Amino acid sequence: SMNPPPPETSNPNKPKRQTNQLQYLLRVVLKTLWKHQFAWPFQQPVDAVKLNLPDYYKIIKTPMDMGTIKKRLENNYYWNAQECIQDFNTMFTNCYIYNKPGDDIVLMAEALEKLFLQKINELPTEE
Numbered sequence: 775s776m777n778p779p780p781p782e783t784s785n786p787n788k789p790k791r792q793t794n795q796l797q798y799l800l801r802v803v804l805k806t807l808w809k810h811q812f813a814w815p816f817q818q819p820v821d822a823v824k825l826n827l828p829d830y831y832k833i834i835k836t837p838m839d840m841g842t843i844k845k846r847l848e849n850n851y852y853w854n855a856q857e858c859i860q861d862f863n864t865m866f867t868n869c870y871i872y873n874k875p876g877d878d879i880v881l882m883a884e885a886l887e888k889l890f891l892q893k894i895n896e897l898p899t900e901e
């Protein structure tokens with residue numbers, strides 16, 4: 775029933791990098807998703823108290839959302855792009871474990887996984 779604290783967006787002793795792929799990720803890919811008409815249920819952490827889904831965090835052991843992700847981008851939290859790219863995979867994957875296919879929240883996810891996959895087919899180069 776209670777919510778856990780949100781995944782860390784800061785960490786002083788994690789190694790950090792502003793790689794150019796990575797700033798594509800925040801500047802194009804995240805904001806390409808961030809403003810899609812279905813981004814809202816994902817712009818922050820799932821709230822099992824307001825939604826009254828107590829079972830959520832018993833099922834979902836590694837929450838991700840775009841809220842923490844955008845922060846992590848703005849926090850140079852990442853070492854490269856694979857890291858951030860798999861913070862998206864878990865965001866979706868959680869939605870496909872917790873819910874069952876056909877659910878409206880599954881729809882929107884799938885919609886966003888595909889645009890996300892569209893915007894991360896082409897990524898800029900290195901310096």
Ligand SMILES: Cc1cc(-c2cc(CS(C)(=O)=O)cnc2Oc2ccc(F)cc2F)n2cn[nH]c(=O)c12
Binds near residue numbers: 821825869879
């Ligand atoms: C990832 C995610 C986000 C929400 C959700 C979030 C918010 C706003 S917040 C973050 O403040 O809680 C409101 N409604 C929600 O549920 C919906 C339920 C029916 C829908 F057609 C559309 C939804 F967005 N979820 C509900 N169930 N399972 C999930 O995995 C899930």
